[PDB]
Every structure is written in structure tokens, then in C-alpha cells.
Ligand binder design. Structure first.
Ligand SMILES: CC(=O)N[C@@H]1[C@@H](O)[C@@H](F)[C@](F)(C(=O)O)O[C@H]1[C@H](O)[C@H](O)CO
Ligand SMILES: *[C@]1(C(=O)O)O[C@@H]([C@H](O)[C@H](O)CO)[C@H](NC(C)=O)[C@@H](O)[C@H]1F
Length: 659
């Protein structure tokens, strides 16, 4: 399969290039594939990589193009004036703009297939959308096509949608190339910045909530939400997936599922993106969500995550019950047997299920992975699969038998429908992990657990206290251990309003820590402790970030090397009142009085490109690793997109910009 036209190194500044003689009437069947390796010199405006049109007066709605917007959206149009058919197919956040002050080379493609009546778009190895349209047009369907151009669309004798940049290579084919070919053709250096990808070894099409941490031995470790039924928080199925690098982030292991339930199979699902359809959710599998990592002094690694029973929504679930009882001064996880109204059972020593009415052991037990046994034998339930037949969502028992689990909707004994926190530990730096441990009811018996602030925890240097950031919706909850993580306590700090106070900590000097957090007022807040987290100041606010009221998670870390002779912190956050966009990395230098001089910043891409949750780590070579949601993860227009959580790196010199 060879192109009808191939051109190289065409640099343009808005004016385009006529290629009518080299394309006229070459699209014999009418189908097409166009593969464009380009970089933009300017992102501003609506720009067409190529345009095939009727250029005559009155025929300005007769064209085909592939376009780029200043927010990284890749799209195509196919329109015919006389039939009044107007097709637009696109996906937000498909391309990259700039990286470290240089234009990024992307490779994109469009495929139009008349037999299928589909338009497909590809960006950097990913098929970002394929859509079947009733009013499909191929090139032969559009009347009086007379003008074929690079970097523009000729409409009524004028160049519209002028491209600014270089078309490094452009190929036009007069047929619909197959998906695997086009994926391969669009694969490039950008593709290699995805650690997690759609339908990799996680089975998930979607990801959110990345976390990076560098261990004491030099291994760089990542965790992330693998979200199977679109990118919805709830209801969904979510697992925590992990991947690591032992060469300073150059190469990563194939992702593994590290915290996962198996009530629902971890399968690749094509979640709909249309208005209305995109609100679809599954009925809900048991869920792990929002991971937090810390390495202990002794090199053991902890990972925490929120746990939600299957079908339980974070909005509706009960705030007035911890899911525990206190009996003889011990905290036991309580259970309700199917058919009962009361919670008459507790999981006690060795996982034995007791009847609290009689205070005697039953035939039932629960193992350390929440699985239920009767007389020493596992009870089972049948796993669910989700599918699209057609195009309706179906959930069904799929023939796989899995252990019955107290978090499942089909369990004979069930936990309270509320949120919990679990942690697991590793003694080999992330290669293998213990069974989970649910946090005891540190908020009290009559309150739900807190929600974790995704990112890392810290070890405060003077006391060795371990601190894990969390929040309740009205308070900060700083979870801590003073015995190297054997037992856990909490400091609960009331907040000025109902902030989703996802926080991260830094240590300014021994005993002095600051908690940086999301608010509901548009600003980033920070609270200060001068006694290793025992007491906290009133909030203060960064002066230079102005976001929407809903806010976004942030990442802030200590950096080990001096910058301008000073101890430094590094912050990552969006900064825009218009959405989750305009990602910035800020360098803060610690002054002698423990205030911070926010001296430098670097915009991660152009300001209208998407930037939501993020995570920073210092690499062992003292470069900075960043993984982030390169899209607006709040927007209802950017839900359920594949391959949008990249990893990139910076040298400090890349970041020391602007002042
Ligand atoms: C890709 C896109 O958004 N194309 C639309 C057309 O589908 C149509 F809506 C039109 F009106 C037009 O020019 O024909 O406007 C443009 C465009 O919004 C504008 O030119 C603003 O640059
Ligand atoms: C972030 C998000 O806003 O994008 O929100 C968290 C909470 O929903 C937050 O309270 C909303 O303000 C999500 N976590 C949970 C537990 O819902 C994050 O995963 C993320 F979705």
C-alpha cells in the first residue's frame, strides 16, 4: 500500500501550499487515509493540516480537513453544501503542543471508510476516536471538489484555517488503511511517554490519579487508578495498578494490578462519549481508588487506598457509621447477614465471624483478603462482565467463580455501605505486597473513614512520625503513626468551608511542616505545623494560583539539592479560572524565616492544554519526574478518553524560568 502523494519538510506560516495538480481526482473510490507528521510553530487559532475542497463561490461548506485547536483537540470535518451534510468527528486532548520550550512532533491520521461509514482519528499511536455517521461523506460524495491544499482549506477563493508549523511528512492514500497499520504509522517519541496504556496488562481502557515515588534504593515507582467503565469516580470498577523503573524513568515494567477486586472482570470497555451516553455508569464493582505511597525508615513501602463496596456511591454513602463495633475495648469490622436488618456479626481473632447476640463463633470466617469461608471452605460467587450489545450496556454473570468477598453485592455477609481505607506493605520495593489492612475507625465509631489525598506521605525528620494526608469534606485529617506504622492516629482540623482538601506535605526545617491543599474557593491553601503535625495554624493561601471553585489536586515535594543556595520545594498544579488547564511547575525557595520565595515557574504545555491531577518525584539523578492527567478530568466534555496520562522529565534548568 503506497501513497498517492507524499511530501516532506513543508514549513508554513498560515499561507498553505496548493497541491491540486498532485492530488486531483486521485481518490478513485472516495475513501482516504492521510498521515501527517508535524510540529506547530504556533498553537493559536483553528488550524487545518490539509484541506480538500470545492473552492468556488457559494461552496464554502464543501470540504474535508483534519484540524487542530489551541487546547490539543484533534478533529476532522467532512461537509457537502448541496446535501447539507456536516460531519465533525474529534476528541479533546489528542496532541501535544510544546515540551521544554520546543514544539512537539506529533503524528496524526484520518481514515474514512465508506463500507463502514466511519471516520477514525489517530494521534501518536492511539486511535483517539472512531465514529460511524449516518450522513457519511467520502471525497467523491462532496460535489465539485477542485482544490487540494497543505496547511489550509480553500473556501470561496480564500485560505481558511491556516496552519503554522512544519509538515515533516504527509502521506495521502486513496483507501482506508487498517487500524494496526495506522497505529504503527503514528507511533513516535510521544507514544513512549505513556506508562499505562489502554488495554495493557491492566485490562483497562482508562486511567486517572497517577502517583510517583522514588525509593531509597533508586527505583522509581508509579501507581494509578485503572478505571474500567470510563473515567467516572463512581459508580465504576477501579483497581490500583503499578509500574516501576530501575533506570531513572527511561523504561518501565509492564503494569500489574496491585489492589484489585475480582467481582467484576478487569476488561477493556468502549465507554460512550456522546452527550447523555457519557453519564452511563456500570452498576458498580468493589473499588479501590486514590492511592498514597510512602517508604518507611526501614525501607518497607506502604501503599494506602480508599476502599468502596460494590455499588456504593461516594455521594450517597453513610457518614454516620464507621463499619466497626467496639466489644471488650477492641474494634471489630461488623457484618450484616443477608436477610437481617441489623449488623449482628463481627470479624474477630483469626478472621472468625462471631454472632454478637450470642457472643459465639459461627461456621464462617473471613481471610486477610476479605474472602468468606464456611467450615474452612471458600464460598464462591460468579463474576460479572460488562459489554456493549448493541449499543446498549449489558452486565452479566460470565461463568468465572471467584471467592465470595465481604465487599461484594452478592456476599452472604456484607460490610456497611461506606468508604474505608486500606494499606498494604512491601519488603522488596514494590515487587510483592502483603495482604491489605483496613484502618481502624480513627474518626470514631459513628463516622465514616476519611478520603485520602492522592500522592505521597512523608516521614518527618526530627520525630520519625509518618504522616498520611486525608480529608472528610469539612476537615483536614492528618493520619499519622508514632511507632513506625504499627498503629495509626489522626489530627482532625476544621476548615473554613467544605473543601475537598486533598493535601500533600513538605518539611521546611526539622519539626516544621506545611500541608498544601485543594479548596473550594479558587486558591491553594497551606497550613503550618511547628510541632511535627500535632497542632496546625490557620490557613494561608498562595497568591499566584487562581483556579475554579471546584479546585484540583496538586503535587508538592521537597527537593534534595540547593537552588540559588536555598532549600527548595517543587509544586505542580493547573492554574486557570477557565478549567483544569495551564499546568505549571513552581519552584519555591525556603527563606531563613520558613516563608517560601516562589521564584520560578515553567508552563508544562500551552496554557489552554489540559492539566488536572499530577504527581512529582525527584529522580535519583536529581532530575524531576512528572506524571499528570493531560486533559481536563472535571469537564463533562473530556470524559472516557484513552492514553492521556503521560510521564515526562525535567532538569532543574528546564524549570528555572520566569523571574
Ligand atoms: C472545526 C470547526 O469548529 N469548524 C466550524 C464549522 O463546523 C462551522 F461551524 C463554521 F461555522 C464554519 O466556518 O463553517 O465554523 C467553524 C469554526 O467554528 C469557525 O470557523 C471558528 O474558527
Ligand atoms: C478528584 C477530582 O476532582 O477529579 O476528586 C476526588 C473527589 O471526588 C473530590 O472530593 C471531589 O471534589 C476523587 N476521589 C474520590 C474518592 O471521589 C478523585 O479520584 C478525583 F476524581
Amino acid at each position: 500500500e503506497t501513497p498517492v502523494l507524499e511530501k516532506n519538510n513543508v514549513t508554513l506560516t498560515g499561507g498553505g501550499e496548493n497541491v491540486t495538480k498532485e492530488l486531483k481526482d486521485k481518490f478513485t473510490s472516495g475513501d482516504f487515509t492521510v498521515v501527517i507528521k508535524y510540529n506547530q510553530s504556533s498553537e493559536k487559532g483553528l488550524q487545518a493540516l490539509f484541506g480538500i475542497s470545492n473552492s468556488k463561490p457559494g461552496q464554502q461548506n464543501s470540504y474535508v480537513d483534519v484540524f487542530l485547536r489551541d487546547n490539543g483537540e484533534l478533529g476532522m470535518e467532512a461537509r457537502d453544501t448541496s446535501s447539507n451534510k456536516n460531519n465533525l468527528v474529534s476528541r479533546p486532548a489528542s496532541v501535544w503542543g510544546k515540551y521544554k520550550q520546543e514544539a512537539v512532533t506529533n503524528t496524526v491520521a484520518v481514515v474514512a471508510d465508506s463500507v463502514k461509514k466511519t471516520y477514525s482519528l489517530y494521534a501518536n499511536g492511539t486511535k483517539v476516536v472512531e465514529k460511524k455517521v449516518d450522513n457519511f461523506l467520502n471525497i467523491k460524495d462532496i460535489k465539485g471538489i477542485d482544490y487540494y491544499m497543505l496547511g489550509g482549506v480553500k473556501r470561496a477563493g480564500k485560505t481558511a484555517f491556516g496552519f503554522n508549523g512544519t509538515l515533516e511528512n504527509i502521506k495521502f492514500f486513496n483507501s482506508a488503511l487498517d487500524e494496526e497499520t495506522v497505529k504503527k504509522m503514528t507511533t513516535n517519541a510521544v507514544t513512549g511517554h505513556l506508562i499505562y496504556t489502554a488495554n495493557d496488562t491492566t485490562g483497562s481502557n482508562y486511567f486517572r490519579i497517577p502517583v510517583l515515588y522514588t525509593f531509597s534504593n533508586g527505583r522509581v515507582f508509579s501507581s494509578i487508578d485503572a478505571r474500567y467503565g470510563g473515567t467516572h469516580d463512581f459508580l465504576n470498577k477501579i483497581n490500583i495498578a503499578t509500574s516501576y523503573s530501575d533506570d531513572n524513568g527511561k523504561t518501565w515494567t509492564k503494569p500489574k494490578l496491585t489492589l484489585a477486586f475480582d467481582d467484576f472482570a478487569p476488561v477493556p470497555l468502549e465507554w460512550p462519549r456522546e452527550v447523555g451516553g457519557r453519564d452511563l455508569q456500570i452498576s458498580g464493582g468493589a473499588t479501590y481508588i486514590d492511592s498514597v505511597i510512602v517508604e518507611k525508615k526501614n525501607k518497607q513501602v506502604l501503599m494506602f487506598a480508599d476502599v468502596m463496596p460494590a455499588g456504593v456511591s461516594f455521594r450517597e454513602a453513610t457518614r454516620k457509621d464507621s463499619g466497626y463495633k467496639q466489644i471488650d475495648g477492641n474494634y471489630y469490622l461488623k457484618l450484616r447477614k443477608q436477610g437481617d436488618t441489623d449488623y449482628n456479626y463481627t470479624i474477630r481473632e483469626n478472621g472468625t465471624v462471631y454472632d454478637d447476640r450470642t457472643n459465639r463463633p459461627t461456621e464462617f470466617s473471613v481471610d486477610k483478603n476479605f474472602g468468606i469461608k464456611q467450615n474452612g471452605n471458600y464460598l464462591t460467587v460468579e463474576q460479572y462482565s460488562v459489554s456493549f450489545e448493541n449499543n446498549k450496556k449489558t452486565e452479566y454473570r460470565n461463568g468465572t467463580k471467584v471467592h465470595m468477598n465481604i465487599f461484594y453485592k452478592d456476599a452472604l455477609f456484607k460490610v456497611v455501605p461506606t468508604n474505608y481505607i486500606a494499606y498494604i506493605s512491601s519488603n522488596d520495593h514494590g515487587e510483592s505486597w502483603s495482604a491489605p489492612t483496613l484502618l481502624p475507625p480513627i474518626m470514631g465509631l459513628n463516622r465514616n473513614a476519611p478520603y485520602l489525598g492522592p500522592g505521597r506521605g512523608i516521614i518527618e525528620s526530627s520525630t520519625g512520625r509518618i504522616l498520611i494526608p486525608s480529608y472528610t469534606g469539612k476537615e483536614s485529617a492528618f493520619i499519622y503513626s508514632d511507632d513506625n506504622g504499627a498503629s495509626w492516629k489522626v489530627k482532625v482540623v476544621p476548615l473554613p468551608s467544605s473543601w475537598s482538601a486533598e493535601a500533600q506535605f513538605v518539611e521546611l526545617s526539622p519539626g516544621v511542616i506545611q500541608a498544601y491543599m485543594r479548596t473550594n474557593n479558587g486558591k491553594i491553601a497551606y497550613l503550618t505545623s511547628k510541632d511535627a503535625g500535632t497542632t496546625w495554624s490557620a490557613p494561608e493561601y498562595l497568591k499566584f494560583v487562581s483556579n475554579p471553585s471546584y479546585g484540583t489536586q496538586l503535587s508538592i515535594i521537597n527537593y534534595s539539592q540547593l537552588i540559588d543556595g536555598k532549600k527548595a520545594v517543587i509544586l505542580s498544579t493547573p492554574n486557570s479560572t477557565n478549567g483544569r488547564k495551564h499546568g505549571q511547575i513552581w519552584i519555591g525557595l525556603i527563606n531563613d524565616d520558613n516563608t517560601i520565595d516562589w521564584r520560578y515557574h515553567h508552563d508544562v504545555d500551552y496554557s489552554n492544554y489540559g492539566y488536572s491531577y499530577s504527581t512529582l518525584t525527584e529522580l535519583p539523578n536529581h532530575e524531576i519526574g512528572l506524571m499528570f492527567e493531560k486533559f481536563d478530568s472535571w469537564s463533562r466534555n473530556e470524559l472516557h478518553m484513552k492514553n492521556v496520562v503521560p510521564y515526562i522529565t525535567f532538569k532543574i534548568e528546564d524549570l528555572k524560568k520566569n523571574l
